[PDB]
Amino acid sequence: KKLPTREESEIIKRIVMISADHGPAVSGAFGSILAACAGIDMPQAVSAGMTMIGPRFGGAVTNAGKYFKMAVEDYPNDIPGFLSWMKKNVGPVPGIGHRVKSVKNPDQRVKY
Amino acid sequence: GFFVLARTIGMIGHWIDQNNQNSRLIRLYDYLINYAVKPEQEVPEK
Amino acid sequence: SILANKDTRAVIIGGVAGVNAAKRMAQFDFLVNRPLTVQAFVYPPEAGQQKEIFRGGELKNVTVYDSLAPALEEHPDINTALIYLGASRAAQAAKEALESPNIQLVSMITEGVPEKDAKRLKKLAQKLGKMLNGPSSIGIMSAGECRLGVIGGEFKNLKLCNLYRQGSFGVLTKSGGLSNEAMWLCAQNGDGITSAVAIGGDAYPGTDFVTYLEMFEKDPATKAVVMIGEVGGNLEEEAAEWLAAEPRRIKLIAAIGGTCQEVLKGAGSARSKMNALRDAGAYVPDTFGGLSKEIKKVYEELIAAGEISTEIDEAVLPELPPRVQEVMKQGEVIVEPLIRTTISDDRGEEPRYAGYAASELCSKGYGIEDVIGLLWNKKLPTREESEIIKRIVMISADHGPAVSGAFGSILAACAGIDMPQAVSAGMTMIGPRFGGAVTNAGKYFKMAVEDYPNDIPGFLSWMKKNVGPVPGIGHRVKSVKNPDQRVKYLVSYIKNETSLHTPCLDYALEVEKVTTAKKGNLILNVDGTIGCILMDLDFPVHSLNGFFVLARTIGMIGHWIDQNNQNSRLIRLYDYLINYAVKPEQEVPEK
Amino acid sequence: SILANKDTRAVIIGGVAGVNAAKRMAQFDFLVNRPLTVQAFVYPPEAGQQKEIFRGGELKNVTVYDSLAPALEEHPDINTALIYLGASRAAQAAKEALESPNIQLVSMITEGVPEKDAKRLKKLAQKLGKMLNGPSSIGIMSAGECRLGVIGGEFKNLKLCNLYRQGSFGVLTKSGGLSNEAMWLCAQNGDGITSAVAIGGDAYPGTDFVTYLEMFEKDPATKAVVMIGEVGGNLEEEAAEWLAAEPRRIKLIAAIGGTCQEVLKGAGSARSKMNALRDAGAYVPDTFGGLSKEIKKVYEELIAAGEISTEIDEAVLPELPPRVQEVMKQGEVIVEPLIRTTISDDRGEEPRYAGYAASELCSKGYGIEDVIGLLWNKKLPTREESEIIKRIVMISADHGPAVSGAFGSILAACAGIDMPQAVSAGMTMIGPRFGGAVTNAGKYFKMAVEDYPNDIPGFLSWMKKNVGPVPGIGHRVKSVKNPDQRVKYLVSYIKNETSLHTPCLDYALEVEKVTTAKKGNLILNVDGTIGCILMDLDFPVHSLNGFFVLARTIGMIGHWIDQNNQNSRLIRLYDYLINYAVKPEQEVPEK
């Protein structure tokens, strides 16, 4: 409900561009492909792929923000405390982990 | 919203792509499924 | 062979460690061409699930049970238990197994089992007349017959140690790693092993060396035993006592570790064990290196005495099937792909959209509109196409909460559904009546330009008779008296700020003059406008509804966020807004 | 070899017939270890698409073009065109190919090409100095070099006819089927072929026998030619004229079909052609069976004259890779499954639900409720469980059009959406606030029974502080003053008509007495009632929401059908029902 500043606007632009697609193997894209092949119209086929966005695929943005803000406030110099608290209370850390990307195969999207 | 909106660009892309290809219905290949099903049995009479 | 044979059927009590042992046992099961040794798993955390275990290339599903009682009820066949649980649970699981009338052999791999617990389990096994191997035992391996545990290592090792057929040597070690070295030494210098038993490195093993030597003495196939002991306790001195006591059929080859009598009386010293065994008539080398020479000595001796036959390994051995990806890399198999993609590649460091790296597009100053063109047309747009895509998306982003799509998202937002799922419900509303006439507007107006260039009444008659209402014409609230500035803006932008020739849009604008003369609300709407503009830009026909679906997702997410920020309650449509034109109430007749 | 060689690069002009030829040519390409012959496809119906063609185990994507001009622009490499189009389009495609400066050879497989068209194409090819083969030609085959068309058949035949290397025999036939028989005859009785050309069976072939014989005469590898003709035309007499005209290096073996002069000047008779060729010095057998003897004669003669070397086929040949499914059936490859299913098997004549044949369930009088139990619990329900499932589904089927799920379906039905998609939008509404509290009601009430047996205020305090509102408590229209007869019925049925002990339901009914004391609408609702009943029946926790999802789908489909039968117009929410609590309107600031 606010007109962004040039800085904000430039970050929103890049986030949208860098996240636009990550091939056909991912749940959302594959859901759309499955529906496209079942002969479903675009808005309905895309809705099936969008249904896949959740805790494991693409929909950990909000929780990553919440838990990392909470870490900054409650565990500023205690990452093992934050991690212990997360293991015991939420499970895997939202925003950490990838099926194909790793230290040996970096995600240039995040580096960018 | 940033992921949901962004990935919609990709998802529409893939839908257009499969339509331009005239892709047939996908039925997952048998060899890719592990049928760890119950042994077959006769149904008892009601 | 002595404890494990082709009649051994096991239950594995443990988790992931247990599953890895079972996978190794299945590899042996394949090599010796026998049915799977593991019949069931007992693991309460994963009870009810099934474990995928490959016997060569064939997948076997092995059931996980909560306790041993249902496992044995479903598989009465089981006569062996392998304990793969941690120290705090292993002794209780071993007790349960020993007390089961079906189980004759219990082997424990567990390390850190309290001596008090091991002592109690040894006495229980003795009372019940059962065999307890371990704790801290890697396994029991019977060449050509049965593998219990991970003993024997990788599949290539099973072949190198000739574990696919009985030899003439028995193996008895405390150490796990050394039972694999002894098996190799028997293959390399003899004719291989009959059975290899790792008794465990714990102070109080379930079964001592003499117990096993007695069994080997009764096995006709075993002609010699390679025993590898260490300093500490007296298991080796009793073995020397056993050997001296009577004339025994089997020859004993022994190596005792712990001649480190330099580092801090010693009744269980390595040199005392070597002397006791040497005196008893065992083949004891000075170093572990001499063990290969003692095996060659005994082997050459048994062939001379006509107890071993020099029958060379003329057997065609199975080889483990490779993974599908390996065979594919070599091009030795045909795998028909499940799907084909032409628009993006995620396999590199970052995605490539129509050949272009995503971050390279950001750096060089491209925008969202340029990514839309790449993913939907596989071509980087022109500055003009880009400027039109940008305006279409911005102009169509939202049209308030009353419209089907927005209302669908609001309904789901209020029903407490998460954003991606809420927005998908709203997006399902996009179709022939709401926002999804972009494609058809483009198609029919292009067809009008080609088949009815100077005949709008003909086009309209054809449409009435064949499709019904014209896609892109009509609006619920907008009319000649209440114009849609969104369409006036786009048309004015295309006419006044570009030199484009738009024949579809020109035709559509002429039919709007005819239709609005019939009913004032039959205006050219945003669907028809975008449809015509994009057809005139020659965008692929399939992509046309993409512009509305994508633009209106901005609005639909907006509405979802708004409803959440407000903490809106569930919507249940007010009664006074429904016309219940329902059947009169009636009693249900008896059947 | 004469027309096709390792330098031949083709464009296939045609559809599915063209793609099947390309697939055959790819198998030859793999066998002789050469790059793919087909570079492109030209087919307007499939323009822009890519065809997956396997060269052995390696997938090659070959592009489809709208016309020849872009194909040659992208592949300047192309020098051959194969026409796989029907008679009405073939001649125009052949004209376009002949007029392309890159194309040197055009072969047509097409049957039914008008004689007038073939005559015009022959004259055009002559003017331009290009080669035209066909129409009605199965292809051109150059052993070890190139295959144009399906000529040569299956991969096993390429190996049997030794088509992976040059022999000494050329083959010229009118007949397609006979070119494969002649190739075999040369492999069986000689050393194989150099090139095999099917000239076509049409009245006017693009290139006649003499044109090809002249080319074979100049090919040093070709020592003899097997020509198979038929009655009709003078092509074989012209070949006899060519052979007689001068002393030729190549030997000619000829068989002429059509000596049926007993079945009901005749210059084109089989007997006249056979005499003309025999007189000219050709090897002409009495029957087609004698052709093997004529080939053996010529082969032995050329060996004797030291023109052929008796060097046996000591070559290690590639074999076609099997499909992944074949290798899997044999268990010779490991394929890690993508998914595991435990509830049904569709692989037989009919599906098996939890081991039971679907039709066997119908025959023995089972119902929908019994199929729900099989697919969701993997157990056939008891008559009691069955009777409870039936009532839960019936009572929950629909609760009018005002509720989110039903309204979502109505919104989508009015937006003109198809049933499965409109019902999916309504189903998306099922969540924490509408109908999807069944699972949580079950979990929290079971936890209450275990952790707060005689402490409802403790349970309620814990819930307020940790989860918020209690799942299964509360209703928008039902209250203590307006009871929900659906919950009264189920409770009444469970207590008075079954032997079921329901601790979760008993607890939930007690918390309802406490909550309705706070607010009258805090009644135990259908979610809480079903949740508790099912938890008490010991149904898997995950399945609990299933009963609402499935039951309310009956209502949601009902509502979709109803709006369709009514021909309902699009819903746009009335303005007076929206509170536009929007920001004051403002001018956009300049960037």
CSV table of C-alpha atoms in Angstrom, one decimal, chain C residues 338-491:
chain,number,residue,atom,x,y,z
C,338,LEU,CA,8.9,-38.9,-19.5
C,339,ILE,CA,8.8,-35.1,-20.5
C,340,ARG,CA,10.6,-32.8,-22.9
C,341,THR,CA,11.3,-29.1,-22.0
C,342,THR,CA,12.5,-26.5,-24.4
C,343,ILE,CA,12.3,-23.2,-22.3
C,344,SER,CA,14.7,-23.5,-19.4
C,345,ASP,CA,17.7,-25.4,-18.1
C,346,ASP,CA,18.3,-25.5,-14.3
C,347,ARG,CA,21.3,-28.0,-14.6
C,348,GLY,CA,24.0,-25.3,-14.4
C,349,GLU,CA,25.0,-22.9,-11.6
C,350,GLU,CA,21.8,-20.8,-12.3
C,351,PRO,CA,18.8,-21.2,-14.7
C,352,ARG,CA,19.1,-20.4,-18.4
C,353,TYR,CA,15.8,-18.9,-19.8
C,354,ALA,CA,15.8,-19.5,-23.6
C,355,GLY,CA,19.7,-19.8,-23.5
C,356,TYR,CA,20.3,-16.7,-21.3
C,357,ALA,CA,21.6,-16.8,-17.7
C,358,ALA,CA,19.0,-15.4,-15.3
C,359,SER,CA,21.6,-13.2,-13.3
C,360,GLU,CA,23.2,-11.9,-16.6
C,361,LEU,CA,19.7,-10.6,-17.5
C,362,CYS,CA,19.5,-8.7,-14.1
C,363,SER,CA,23.1,-7.2,-14.5
C,364,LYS,CA,22.5,-6.0,-18.1
C,365,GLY,CA,19.4,-4.1,-17.0
C,366,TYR,CA,16.6,-6.3,-18.2
C,367,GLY,CA,13.2,-6.6,-16.4
C,368,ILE,CA,10.3,-8.9,-15.5
C,369,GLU,CA,8.7,-8.1,-18.9
C,370,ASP,CA,11.9,-9.4,-20.6
C,371,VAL,CA,11.8,-12.7,-18.6
C,372,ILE,CA,8.1,-13.1,-19.6
C,373,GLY,CA,9.1,-12.8,-23.3
C,374,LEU,CA,12.0,-15.3,-22.8
C,375,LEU,CA,10.0,-18.0,-21.0
C,376,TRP,CA,6.8,-17.6,-23.1
C,377,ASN,CA,8.2,-16.8,-26.6
C,378,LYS,CA,11.9,-18.1,-26.3
C,379,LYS,CA,13.0,-14.6,-27.7
C,380,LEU,CA,14.2,-11.5,-25.9
C,381,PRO,CA,11.6,-8.8,-26.5
C,382,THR,CA,12.1,-5.6,-28.4
C,383,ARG,CA,12.0,-2.3,-26.4
C,384,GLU,CA,8.5,-1.7,-28.0
C,385,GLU,CA,7.1,-5.3,-27.2
C,386,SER,CA,8.6,-4.9,-23.7
C,387,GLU,CA,6.9,-1.5,-23.1
C,388,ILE,CA,3.5,-3.0,-24.2
C,389,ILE,CA,3.9,-6.2,-22.0
C,390,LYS,CA,4.8,-3.9,-19.0
C,391,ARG,CA,1.6,-1.8,-19.5
C,392,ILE,CA,-0.7,-4.9,-20.0
C,393,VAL,CA,0.6,-6.5,-16.8
C,394,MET,CA,0.2,-3.2,-14.8
C,395,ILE,CA,-3.2,-2.3,-16.2
C,396,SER,CA,-4.7,-5.8,-15.5
C,397,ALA,CA,-3.0,-6.4,-12.0
C,398,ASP,CA,-6.2,-5.8,-10.1
C,399,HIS,CA,-9.9,-4.8,-10.6
C,400,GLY,CA,-11.2,-4.8,-7.0
C,401,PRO,CA,-12.6,-7.6,-4.8
C,402,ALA,CA,-16.0,-8.2,-6.5
C,403,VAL,CA,-14.5,-10.2,-9.5
C,404,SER,CA,-14.6,-14.1,-9.4
C,405,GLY,CA,-10.8,-14.5,-9.2
C,406,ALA,CA,-10.2,-11.9,-6.4
C,407,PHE,CA,-13.3,-13.1,-4.6
C,408,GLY,CA,-12.1,-16.8,-4.8
C,409,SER,CA,-8.8,-15.7,-3.2
C,410,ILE,CA,-10.6,-13.6,-0.5
C,411,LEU,CA,-12.9,-16.6,0.3
C,412,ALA,CA,-9.9,-18.9,0.7
C,413,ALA,CA,-8.0,-16.2,2.6
C,414,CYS,CA,-10.9,-16.0,5.1
C,415,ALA,CA,-11.2,-19.9,5.2
C,416,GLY,CA,-7.6,-19.7,6.6
C,417,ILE,CA,-5.9,-21.3,3.6
C,418,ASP,CA,-2.3,-20.4,2.7
C,419,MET,CA,-1.4,-18.0,0.0
C,420,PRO,CA,-0.3,-20.4,-2.9
C,421,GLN,CA,-3.5,-22.6,-2.4
C,422,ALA,CA,-5.8,-19.5,-1.8
C,423,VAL,CA,-4.5,-17.9,-5.1
C,424,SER,CA,-4.8,-21.2,-7.0
C,425,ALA,CA,-8.6,-21.2,-6.1
C,426,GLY,CA,-9.0,-17.6,-7.5
C,427,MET,CA,-6.9,-18.5,-10.6
C,428,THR,CA,-9.3,-21.5,-11.3
C,429,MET,CA,-12.0,-18.8,-11.9
C,430,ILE,CA,-10.1,-17.4,-15.0
C,431,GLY,CA,-11.9,-18.8,-18.0
C,432,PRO,CA,-14.4,-18.0,-20.7
C,433,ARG,CA,-16.4,-15.5,-18.6
C,434,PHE,CA,-13.7,-14.0,-16.5
C,435,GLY,CA,-10.4,-12.8,-17.8
C,436,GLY,CA,-9.7,-16.0,-19.9
C,437,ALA,CA,-11.1,-14.8,-23.2
C,438,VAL,CA,-7.7,-13.3,-24.2
C,439,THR,CA,-6.8,-16.3,-26.5
C,440,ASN,CA,-10.2,-16.7,-28.1
C,441,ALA,CA,-10.5,-12.9,-28.7
C,442,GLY,CA,-7.2,-13.0,-30.5
C,443,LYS,CA,-8.2,-16.1,-32.6
C,444,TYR,CA,-11.7,-14.8,-33.6
C,445,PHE,CA,-10.6,-11.3,-34.4
C,446,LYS,CA,-7.7,-12.5,-36.5
C,447,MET,CA,-10.2,-14.8,-38.3
C,448,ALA,CA,-12.6,-11.8,-38.8
C,449,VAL,CA,-9.8,-9.7,-40.4
C,450,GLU,CA,-9.1,-12.7,-42.8
C,451,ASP,CA,-12.6,-14.0,-43.5
C,452,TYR,CA,-14.9,-10.9,-43.0
C,453,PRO,CA,-12.7,-7.8,-43.7
C,454,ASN,CA,-15.6,-5.5,-44.7
C,455,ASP,CA,-18.4,-7.6,-43.2
C,456,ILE,CA,-18.9,-7.1,-39.4
C,457,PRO,CA,-22.6,-8.3,-39.6
C,458,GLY,CA,-21.4,-11.5,-41.3
C,459,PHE,CA,-18.7,-12.0,-38.6
C,460,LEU,CA,-21.3,-11.4,-35.8
C,461,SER,CA,-23.8,-13.8,-37.5
C,462,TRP,CA,-21.2,-16.5,-37.8
C,463,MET,CA,-20.2,-16.0,-34.2
C,464,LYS,CA,-23.8,-16.1,-32.8
C,465,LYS,CA,-24.5,-19.3,-34.8
C,466,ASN,CA,-21.1,-21.1,-34.0
C,467,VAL,CA,-19.5,-19.9,-30.8
C,468,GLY,CA,-22.2,-17.7,-29.0
C,469,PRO,CA,-21.2,-14.4,-27.3
C,470,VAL,CA,-18.1,-12.8,-28.9
C,471,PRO,CA,-14.9,-13.3,-26.7
C,472,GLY,CA,-13.6,-9.9,-25.7
C,473,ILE,CA,-16.9,-8.1,-26.0
C,474,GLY,CA,-19.2,-7.2,-23.0
C,475,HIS,CA,-18.8,-6.2,-19.3
C,476,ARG,CA,-20.9,-6.5,-16.1
C,477,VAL,CA,-20.3,-2.8,-14.9
C,478,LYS,CA,-18.4,-1.0,-17.8
C,479,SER,CA,-20.5,0.4,-20.7
C,480,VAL,CA,-20.7,3.3,-23.2
C,481,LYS,CA,-22.0,5.4,-20.3
C,482,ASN,CA,-19.3,4.1,-17.9
C,483,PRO,CA,-16.1,3.6,-20.1
C,484,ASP,CA,-13.2,1.4,-19.2
C,485,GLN,CA,-10.2,3.7,-19.1
C,486,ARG,CA,-7.9,0.6,-19.0
C,487,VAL,CA,-8.9,-0.1,-22.7
C,488,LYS,CA,-8.9,3.6,-23.6
C,489,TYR,CA,-5.4,3.9,-22.2
C,490,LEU,CA,-3.9,0.8,-24.0
C,491,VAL,CA,-5.6,1.7,-27.3
